[PDB]
Design an enzyme around this catalytic site. Structure first.
Site, mmCIF file in Angstrom:
data_model
loop_
_atom_site.group_PDB
_atom_site.id
_atom_site.type_symbol
_atom_site.label_atom_id
_atom_site.label_comp_id
_atom_site.label_asym_id
_atom_site.label_seq_id
_atom_site.Cartn_x
_atom_site.Cartn_y
_atom_site.Cartn_z
ATOM 1 N N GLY G 31 -13.577 19.754 8.035
ATOM 2 C CA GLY G 31 -13.569 19.356 9.451
ATOM 3 C C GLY G 31 -14.573 19.441 10.411
ATOM 4 O O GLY G 31 -14.889 19.045 11.490
ATOM 5 N N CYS G 240 4.910 -8.555 5.929
ATOM 6 C CA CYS G 240 3.705 -9.426 5.823
ATOM 7 C C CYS G 240 4.170 -10.968 5.437
ATOM 8 O O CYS G 240 5.072 -11.048 4.571
ATOM 9 C CB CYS G 240 2.840 -8.871 4.654
ATOM 10 S SG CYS G 240 1.731 -9.907 3.842
ATOM 11 N N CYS G 243 2.952 -11.320 1.213
ATOM 12 C CA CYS G 243 3.533 -10.505 0.250
ATOM 13 C C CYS G 243 4.986 -9.913 0.748
ATOM 14 O O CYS G 243 5.789 -9.252 -0.281
ATOM 15 C CB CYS G 243 2.922 -9.259 -0.357
ATOM 16 S SG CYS G 243 2.929 -7.695 0.891
ATOM 17 N N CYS G 265 -0.914 -8.250 5.492
ATOM 18 C CA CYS G 265 -1.528 -6.960 5.201
ATOM 19 C C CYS G 265 -2.928 -6.810 5.595
ATOM 20 O O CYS G 265 -3.731 -7.551 5.246
ATOM 21 C CB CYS G 265 -1.163 -6.312 3.700
ATOM 22 S SG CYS G 265 0.530 -6.529 3.497
ATOM 23 N N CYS G 271 -1.936 -6.174 -0.893
ATOM 24 C CA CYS G 271 -1.215 -7.517 -0.696
ATOM 25 C C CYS G 271 -1.240 -8.304 -1.926
ATOM 26 O O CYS G 271 -0.304 -8.719 -2.100
ATOM 27 C CB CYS G 271 -1.937 -8.075 0.479
ATOM 28 S SG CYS G 271 -0.710 -9.430 1.302
#
Ligand SMILES: O=P(O)(O)OC[C@H]1O[C@@H]2OP(=O)(O)O[C@@H]2[C@@H]1O
Ligand SMILES: O=P(O)(O)OC[C@H]1O[C@@H]2OP(=O)(O)O[C@@H]2[C@@H]1O
Ligand SMILES: [Zn+2]
Ligand SMILES: [Zn+2]
Ligand SMILES: [Zn+2]
Ligand SMILES: [Zn+2]
Lengths: 278, 143, 193, 353, 353, 143, 278
Positions: G31, G240, G243, G265, G271
C-alpha cells in the site's frame, strides 16, 4: 505628412474619440485612473502602448513631437516610437524641450521647465499606486472610491521603522488635488516636485493595464512623506562629466571592468544646452 | 605540452564542419589501415551549468554526442567526442586523432589539415562578429 | 581472473528478478535461481544472481568479512559498478553468512516513517533452508500460514520474531542457500513453533 | 572628455537586419512559403489564430514565418494587425450542431449516436522520432469508407434529456466585449470565456492540470470533443437577410464536471465549455476546465486553487500582455535602477556607520 | 441482438494516416524540410530544444515537422527520444564568461563594458504584418563593423565587486537530478532550476508577470541578458583530460531582484538566474523571475502569490505532464462515468422520493 | 422563395474556391458592364458563439471578411461578403450576384455556374467524409 | 521476438533494475507509494506510462500478455500499448484472462478470478488516495508516515451527512494489510472486493506522479466504509444485452438520439465466455 497607408496617427477615429473622452474625464477627475478600451499597438504591451495611444489621439499636424526614454531622445524605444509617429503622422519632431508641443516620456520629466500649451504624456506600467501593497484591482478600486489610503501610509511607516527611510525611490506616490493618491509613472523622486503647479497638462497612459489619468495645469501634487522624514530627491557626489551640472538627474556609465565610471545627465537635451552655455 | 596539442587538434576536429573535414581528408589521400575499436555511437552529454554562471552546479538539459574510437596497425588509439549525431564525422575525427599521434603524420597534418581548419573557423567567426558588432549601440566617444 | 556474470544478462536478470519477486510476494516460498551456474565463492549462486539482477551504481553493497574477497569485490565492481561500502549502515544491499552479529544487524538502515523504502535489504547466506528451528509465518503473501525451517542465527530469529522496528520501518530478509532462496519481508509475522 | 553620439537608430536597424537574415537562414535552402507553413505546420497556425484573435490561416502562417516560428511573437503580430482592420459585421451565433465533422469523440460512453470519429489525431501514436522525415517521402494513400455523416447529437443534449445535466439556456443577455471595454472583475461568464479563448495555452493547461491534481478539483469528464467546419453567417444592413460568408475549422469541447445538489432541484452535473479555431484540442479542453473553475462564485464553491482565483487567472492569461511586460525588462531601466542604487548605497553606509 | 466487433486497430491506423496526410498537406506544395524548419523557424526550435531536454537543433526541427508545428507534441517527441539514448558523458560546468556573443544587453546601466549588443532581435520592431513574405524576397545585405569582441564581463560581477550584490559561490554541492530521482518538496535550488528550464514557457511567463503585478513582487531589473555560443567540454575516462566536444547556442539571463537587509551583513540585491538553449530569451527571463520567487524560503519571505508556492509551480510546470494529463480526458472514461452516473441517479431518486 | 434563392447562390459563391470560380466565369465569357459601388474591402467579422453551443452568446474572436458591391447598367445591385481577403473573388461574387437578379441570366447561370459549383463542393465534401469515416471506431453490429 | 532496434521491452537495463528494486520495496511495504525515477515513454504522461514501465521491467519472453482498458482488449489505448509491447518484446498476447501471465489494465479488474503466478498491473493517474482532500504531497507524505488518516474519515462522514452516501464511486480508498490507505486505481467500487486475499500479485504504477506500489498475494484489502453505510457495489436493473450476465460491471451504450440504450459487460473476455457458455 502621413504617407504610409494608415489613418493619421494610426488609430481609427472611433478609438481616438473614445480615448479623447477618457482624457477629458481624467482631466475633470485629477489623479483618478480612467479605464479605456485600449488597443494593441505595433509595440508590445509594456513598451509604451498607452502613451502611443494618447499621443495619437491628441497629436495634430502642427504639433512638434518630442519623444524621450530615460531622459534621452536617442534611446532605442524613443527612436522606435518617434519613427513610428513620423511614419503615420509626418509631424515635426524635436529633441529640444522648449520647442516641443507634445512630450511623450518614459521615466523622466525634463529638467527644462514646461510651459503653457505643452502636453507631457507619461508611459505608465502600473497605474495603481497601491498595486504593490494590494495586487487585486477589486480592492484598490474600492480603496480609491472610499479614500481608504491607510495601507499606503502603513507601508511608508513600516518602511521607516525597518530601514529608517521610505523604500520607494521611483514611481513615488503623490496626492493630487488634495484627494487622489496617484502613481506618477516610474520617474525618479527627483522629478516629482516638477509635477506640482506646472503650467503644462500632464497625461498618463497605461495601455496594458487600460488606464488613463491626468493632472491639469496648476494642480497640487504632493509626495507622501513625513515631517521628520521629508521628501528628498536623489543626490550624487559628482556633477555631470560632460556639462558639469549639479542640478540634474545623473545616469551612471560603467566605463571599464576595473570600477571606473562616470555620471552624465539623463536629460540629454538639458545636457546639450548646458554644454553649449559653457 | 603533448596533452595540450592533442586537446587542440581534437577541438579543431570537433568544431569543424563535417563537409569541409571530409573534403579536406579526401583531398589529402591518406593511406592508413585502421580498425574501429568503438563503432560511432550517438548518445547524450548531460550539460552542467552554474547558478549565476559561477555558483552551484545544476543540470541544464542534455545534448546529442557522438563518440568513436579506432586503432591503427601500430596500436595507436584515436578517439573522438563531437556534439551532434554525425557518425561518419566522428569516425573521421577519431582516425585523424590516431594519425596525429604518429610522428610521420603530426607535422604534415598539422600544417595541412588542422591549421587550415582552425583558420577557416576563425575567419567565419570574425565575419559573424563584424556583422553582430554592427548592432552595437554607441553612446559616448572619448574626444 | 574476474568472475563471470550471466551468460544472457537481460534474460537471466529478468528470470532471477521474477523468481525473487515470487519469493518476496509469497514469504517462505523457496525458489531456484538456475541461470547462474557458479557463484562468486564464498558467495553462493542465489546471492550472486540477486546482486547481478539488482545491484548497480545506485545501490551500495556491504559484504561481511567472511564473504568479503578481493576477487568477489573486483567482479562486483566490474559487472555491476555497485559501490562497495565497509559499514553496514551505508548499504542498500547487505550480504552476510551465519556469523552476522547483533550489532551489524542493528546497524543496517531500516528506512524512515516517511521513506520506508530507503532502508537496506539483507541477503543472508544460510547453511540450509530446511533443518533449523521450525517457524510459522503469517501475513501478507500467505493465505493461511506457511511452515519453514531455515537454519538461522539467533539475532536474525530475534529480529524476525520480535520486530523491534515499527512498521513500515524494517529490513527485508533474503535467505540464500546454494542456488535456492526464500524471502521474508518486514511485514511477515514469524512465530518460533 | 566624453561626448554623446547617436547610435540608437543605426543599432536598431542593424539588429532588425540581423534578425531578418537569421529568419531567412541559409540561402542555399529555399525560402519557406506561407502556404507551406499553413498546410504542414497547421497546429501552430491553429494556436496562432486562436490566441491572435483572427481566424485567417494564411495570416497566422505569415505571422509565424515573420516571427521565425515564435508562437508568442506571431500571436502578437496577428493581434496587432487586428487593430488596423474595420469591423464590417458581427456574425450570427455559431451553431455547432451544424458542424461538418472531421473528428468527434466522447469519453463518457463507450459508443454514442454518430460514433467515435477519431479523425486526424496524434492520439494513440507511439511518439518515436520519425527520421524518415529527414528526407522527402510519400503520404499514405487514405482508405475510404461510406461518405455519409451520421447524426451526431451533442452528448450534453443526451445528458440533459435524462435530467443528468442542465441545458445551457439563452436569456438574450448581451455579451461583454473585452476588446472594447477593459474587464471589470468579477467578469461575466461571457467575458471570462472570451478571455480564456485568447489566453495562453500553456498557462491555462497548467491551471487545468492543477485542478485535476486537487487544486480546485471539478471532477471533469470529456463529455464531447468535436472538430470540423462550421458555417459563418451575417445579416448585412444592405440586404436585411442572412448570408453565409463561408466556413471556419473549429474545435469545441464540452466537459462534464462534478455534480451539485442545489436546494430546490435534482442534483445534476456541472459543465465547462471550450472553443478554439482549428484542430488543436488541448486549448479547448483547458479552456473548459478553467471556465468551470472560474464558475465557482455561481456555485458558492470554496476556492482551493489558484485556477479558481478569477483575477489572478484572467489578468495574467493573455500572453500578449504577459510576454510584453516580461520582455519590457529588456528595455533600459537605468534611471530607476540608479534611484534603487542610491537608496541601497545610503542604507549600506548607514548600517556600516 | 448486438455482437461485438473489432474496430480499435483499424480506426487508430486510419486516424494516424489522416494525421500524416494533413501534416503533408497539399502535395502541390513541396514538402517542408527539417533543415528549413531549423533555419527559418529557429525560435520554435529553440523552445522545443529547451523544453524537450535535448540541444540538437535538427532533432527539434524534426519533432516540429512530425508534430505539424505543435510545440507541445514536438517537445514530448524530443523528451521521449531522450529516453532511448545512453548518457555517454557529463559535461564540465558551463562557463558563460567564455560565450561568443551574438547579443548582450543590460537594463541597469545606460552603457557597460563591452557595450549594448542588440544582436538579432525583434525588439523595437513595429509589429506590422509583412505581406512581402507572401512571396520570395531578398534578405538584407548585412552591414559590417569591427570584428573584435570587446571584453564583456558579467554585470553581476561589477555589482558584486561594489558590494551591491553577492557572488554566487560554489561549495561543491552535488546537483540534484530530477531525471533520475523524482522531486522531493522542498527542492534544492539546483532541482528547481532544472525543472524551470524544462518548464512550460507560457505558464512560467504568466507566473513571472503576476509577480511583476504584485503577486509575490521581487523588484526585478534585467541585469544582463547574453545570447551566444558556449563551448562544451567533457573528461572521458579513456583519456583522462578535458576535450571540447563542440559549442551550443545558449541564452543566459541574470536578474537583479529586491534588496534585502540581513541581520549581520550589508543590505544587497537579490538575484535570479535563467538559462535556455538558443536565442529565445523570454523563457530565460521568466525562469529567473520564478527562480527568485521560489527562493522565498531562503529569505524568509511571506508568500503573496502562487509563483512563490513551490509545489504548485513546479508540480504543474512540465508541459509534458500537464498536456498529457489534460489530453488523457480524451481517453475512454465510461466505466468511471458509469460509477458517477449510478450514484447521481440514486441521489436524484432519493431526493424525488 | 426569391430571398432563399439569392441566399443559396450567394452561399455557393462564398463557399467556392476562388480559382474555380474565376476559371468558370472566364469560360462563360459574360459581357456585362458594371461599376463598383463599394471597392472590395477586407475587414473583420466578429464571431459570436454560444455557451455550451446553445446558451448565452460570447465573442469567440474574429475572422477576416471581404465585402464588395457593384451596380449594373439597369440599376441592379450585386453584393458579396466572403470570409478571407480575396478582393478579386469578392468582386466576382458581387458581379454574379447582380447578374443572377436579371431574368436574362438567372436560368443560364443557375444551370451553368451555380449548380456546377455546388456539385463540385459537395463532391469534395463527400470524398473527405469517406476518408474521415475510415477513422470511425466500430464497437457493435446488429445481427 | 524483439526485432525493432530497441532493447527488449524498450527500457534500458538500468531503468528496469531501478523499477525492479522499487517493485520489491513496494511488495515488502503493501500500500505504500514507492517513488521511482520513471522515464518518458512513447505514450504521453497520463496514458499509462507507469503500467508500461512496470510491464517492461517484469515481462519475459515466455509471458502471455493481456492488455485491457475499460475492461476491453480492443480499446484504443489497449491496442496501442499491446502493439507497442508486441513490437519491442515479441511476447505472446491474449484476450483470455485465464491464459494471461501478465495483465496490464486501466480501470477494471477482470471478472474471471486471478490465479497464482498471475501479475495484474494497474495504470494509476493519482497514486495518493488523499490527494483530492489534500492537494500537497508535502502533507500527504507525512500523513501516511504518521498514519494521520482522519481527513479521509472526515471526508467520508461529511459525504454521508451531505448526500446520505459516500460520494467516491471509483478509485475507492482501501486499507491494505491493516495499515496503509491506498488508492486502488480508477477501478469502479465493483472491483474493490476482488483485491482482498487474491492469489495474484497486484502492482500499481503512476508514471506521471512517479510512484509504484503493490499488494502481495493473499493480503487484506478493505474498502473504507461504515457499519450502517457498508461498502456497496454498482448495480443495474438490466443484465448484459449480449451474454445476459447479472454479475458483471456494465457499460451503457447510447444507441439513438431518442434515448434508446443498452448495457453490456465492460469485461469483453468475460462476456465472450458467457456468450459461448449459452
Ligand atoms: O503598458 P504600456 O504598453 O503602456 O507600457 C507602459 C510601461 O510599461 C513598461 O514598464 P516601463 O515603466 O519600464 O516602461 C514600459 C512602458 O513604458
Ligand atoms: O501517469 P501514467 O502515464 O502512468 O497514466 C496513468 C493514468 O493516468 C490517466 O488517468 P486515467 O486513470 O484515466 O487513465 C490514464 C492513465 O491510465
Ligand atoms: Zn550634463
Ligand atoms: Zn519597467
Ligand atoms: Zn482519467
Ligand atoms: Zn455480457
Amino acid at each position: 505628412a502621413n504617407l504610409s497607408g494608415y489613418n493619421f496617427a494610426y488609430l481609427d477615429e472611433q478609438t481616438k474619440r473614445m480615448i479623447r473622452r477618457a482624457i477629458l474625464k481624467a482631466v475633470a477627475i485629477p489623479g483618478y485612473q480612467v479605464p479605456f478600451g485600449g488597443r494593441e499597438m505595433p509595440m508590445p504591451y509594456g513598451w509604451g502602448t498607452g502613451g502611443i495611444q494618447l499621443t495619437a489621439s491628441v497629436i495634430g499636424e502642427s504639433d512638434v513631437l518630442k519623444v524621450i526614454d530615460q531622459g534621452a531622445d536617442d534611446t532605442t524605444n524613443a527612436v522606435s516610437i518617434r519613427n513610428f509617429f513620423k511614419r503615420v503622422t509626418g509631424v515635426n519632431t524635436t529633441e529640444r524641450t522648449d520647442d516641443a508641443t507634445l512630450i511623450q516620456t518614459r521615466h523622466r520629466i525634463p529638467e527644462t521647465p514646461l510651459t503653457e500649451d505643452q502636453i507631457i504624456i507619461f508611459q505608465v506600467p502600473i497605474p495603481e499606486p497601491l498595486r504593490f501593497i494590494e495586487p487585486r484591482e477589486t480592492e484598490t478600486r474600492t480603496m480609491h472610491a472610499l479614500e481608504e489610503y491607510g495601507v499606503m501610509q502603513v507601508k511608508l511607516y513600516e518602511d521607516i521603522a525597518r530601514f529608517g527611510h521610505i523604500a520607494t525611490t521611483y514611481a513615488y506616490p503623490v496626492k493630487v488635488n488634495g484627494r487622489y493618491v496617484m502613481d506618477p509613472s516610474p520617474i525618479p523622486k527627483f522629478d516629482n516636485p516638477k509635477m506640482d503647479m506646472m503650467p503644462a497638462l500632464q497625461l498618463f497612459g497605461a495601455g496594458r493595464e487600460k488606464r488613463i489619468y491626468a493632472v491639469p495645469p496648476f494642480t497640487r501634487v504632493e509626495s507622501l512623506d513625513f515631517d521628520d522624514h521629508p521628501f528628498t530627491v536623489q543626490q550624487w557626489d559628482e556633477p555631470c562629466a560632460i556639462c558639469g551640472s549639479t542640478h540634474s538627474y545623473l545616469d551612471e556609465v560603467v566605463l571599464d571592468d576595473a570600477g571606473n565610471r562616470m555620471f552624465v545627465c539623463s536629460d540629454t537635451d538639458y545636457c546639450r544646452q548646458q554644454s553649449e552655455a559653457k | 605540452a603533448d596533452t595540450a596539442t592533442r586537446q587542440h587538434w581534437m577541438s579543431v576536429l570537433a568544431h569543424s564542419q563535417p563537409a569541409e573535414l571530409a573534403a579536406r581528408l579526401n583531398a589529402l589521400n591518406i593511406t592508413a589501415d585502421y580498425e574501429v575499436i568503438r563503432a560511432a555511437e550517438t548518445g547524450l552529454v548531460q550539460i552542467q551549468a552554474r547558478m549565476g554562471g559561477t555558483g552551484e552546479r545544476f543540470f541544464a538539459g542534455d545534448a546529442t554526442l557522438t563518440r568513436a574510437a579506432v586503432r591503427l596497425t601500430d596500436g595507436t588509439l584515436g578517439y573522438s567526442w563531437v556534439l551532434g549525431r554525425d557518425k561518419q564525422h566522428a569516425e573521421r575525427c577519431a582516425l585523424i586523432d590516431a594519425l596525429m599521434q604518429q610522428s610521420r603524420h603530426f607535422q604534415n597534418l598539422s600544417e595541412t589539415l588542422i591549421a587550415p581548419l582552425d583558420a577557416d573557423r576563425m575567419a567565419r567567426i570574425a565575419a559573424r562578429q563584424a556583422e553582430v558588432n554592427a548592432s552595437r549601440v554607441d553612446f559616448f566617444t572619448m574626444v | 581472473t574476474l568472475e563471470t556474470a550471466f551468460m544472457l544478462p537481460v534474460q537471466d536478470a529478468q528470470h532471477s528478478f521474477r523468481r525473487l519477486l515470487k519469493a518476496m510476494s509469497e514469504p517462505g516460498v523457496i525458489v531456484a535461481l538456475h541461470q547462474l551456474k557458479r557463484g562468486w565463492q564464498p558467495l553462493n549462486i542465489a546471492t550472486t544472481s540477486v546482486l547481478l539482477t539488482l545491484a548497480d551504481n545506485d545501490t551500495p553493497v556491504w559484504l561481511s568479512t567472511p564473504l568479503n574477497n578481493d576477487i568477489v569485490n573486483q567482479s562486483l565492481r566490474f559487472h555491476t559498478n555497485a559501490p562497495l561500502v565497509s559499514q553496514p549502515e551505508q548499504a542498500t544491499f547487505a550480504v552476510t553468512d551465519e556469523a552476522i552479529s547483533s550489532e551489524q544487524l542493528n546497524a543496517l538502515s531500516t528506512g524512515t516513517a516517511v521513506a520506508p523504502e530507503a532502508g537496506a535489504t539483507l541477503i543472508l547466506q544460510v547453511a540450509s533452508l530446511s533443518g533449523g528451528r521450525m517457524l510459522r509465518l503469517t501475513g501478507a503473501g500467505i493465505a493461511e500460514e506457511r511452515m519453514i525451517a531455515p537454519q538461522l542465527p539467533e539475532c536474525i530469529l530475534h529480529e524476525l520474531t520480535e520486530r523491534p522496528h515499527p512498521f513500515p520501518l524494517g529490513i527485508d530478509l533474503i535467505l540464500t542457500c546454494g542456488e535456492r532462496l526464500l524471502a521474508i519481508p518486514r511485514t511477515t509475522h514469524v512465530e518460533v513453533c | 572628455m566624453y561626448v554623446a553620439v547617436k547610435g540608437g537608430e543605426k543599432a536598431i536597424d542593424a539588429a532588425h537586419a540581423l534578425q531578418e537574415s537569421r529568419r531567412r537562414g541559409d540561402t542555399d535552402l529555399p525560402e519557406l512559403s506561407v502556404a507551406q507553413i499553413e498546410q504542414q505546420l497547421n497546429l501552430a497556425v491553429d494556436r496562432v489564430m486562436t490566441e491572435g484573435g483572427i481566424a485567417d490561416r494564411e495570416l497566422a502562417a505569415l505571422a509565424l514565418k515573420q516571427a521565425s516560428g515564435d508562437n508568442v511573437e506571431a500571436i502578437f503580430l496577428l493581434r496587432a494587425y487586428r487593430t488596423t482592420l474595420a469591423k464590417l459585421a458581427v456574425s450570427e451565433p455559431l451553431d455547432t450542431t451544424g458542424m461538418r465533422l472531421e473528428r468527434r469523440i466522447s469519453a463518457v460512453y463507450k459508443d454514442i449516436p454518430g460514433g467515435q470519429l477519431l479523425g486526424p489525431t496524434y492520439d494513440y501514436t507511439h511518439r518515436l522520432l520519425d527520421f524518415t522525415l529527414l528526407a522527402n517521402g510519400e503520404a499514405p494513400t487514405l482508405t475510404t469508407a461510406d461518405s455519409e455523416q451520421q447524426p451526431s447529437p451533442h452528448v450534453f443534449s443526451l445528458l440533459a434529456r435524462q435530467g443528468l445535466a442542465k441545458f445551457e439556456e439563452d436569456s438574450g443577455a448581451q455579451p461583454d466585449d473585452i476588446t472594447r471595454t477593459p474587464p471589470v472583475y468579477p467578469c461575466s461568464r461571457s467575458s471570462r470565456l472570451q478571455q480564456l479563448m485568447r489566453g495562453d495555452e500553456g498557462y491555462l493547461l497548467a491551471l487545468a492540470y492543477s485542478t485535476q491534481r486537487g487544486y480546485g478539483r471539478n471532477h471533469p469528464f470529456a463529455g464531447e470533443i468535436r472538430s470540423g467546419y462550421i458555417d459563418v453567417s451575417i445579416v448585412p444592413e444592405e440586404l436585411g437577410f442572412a448570408v453565409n460568408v463561408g466556413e471556419l475549422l473549429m474545435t469545441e469541447c464540452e466537459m462534464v464536471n462534478g455534480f451539485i445538489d442545489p436546494p430546490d432541484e435534482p442534483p445534476h452535473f456541472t459543465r465547462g465549455y471550450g472553443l478554439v479555431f482549428g484542430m488543436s484540442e488541448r486549448k479547448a479542453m483547458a479552456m473548459a476546465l478553467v471556465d468551470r473553475a472560474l464558475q465557482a462564485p455561481e456555485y458558492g464553491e470554496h476556492a482551493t486553487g489558484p485556477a479558481q482565483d478569477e483575477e489572478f487567472v484572467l489578468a495574467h492569461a493573455d500572453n500578449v500582455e504577459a510576454a510584453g511586460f516580461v520582455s519590457h525588462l529588456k528595455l533600459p531601466h537605468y534611471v530607476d535602477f540608479q534611484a534603487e542604487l542610491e537608496l541601497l548605497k545610503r542604507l549600506q553606509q548607514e548600517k556600516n556607520h
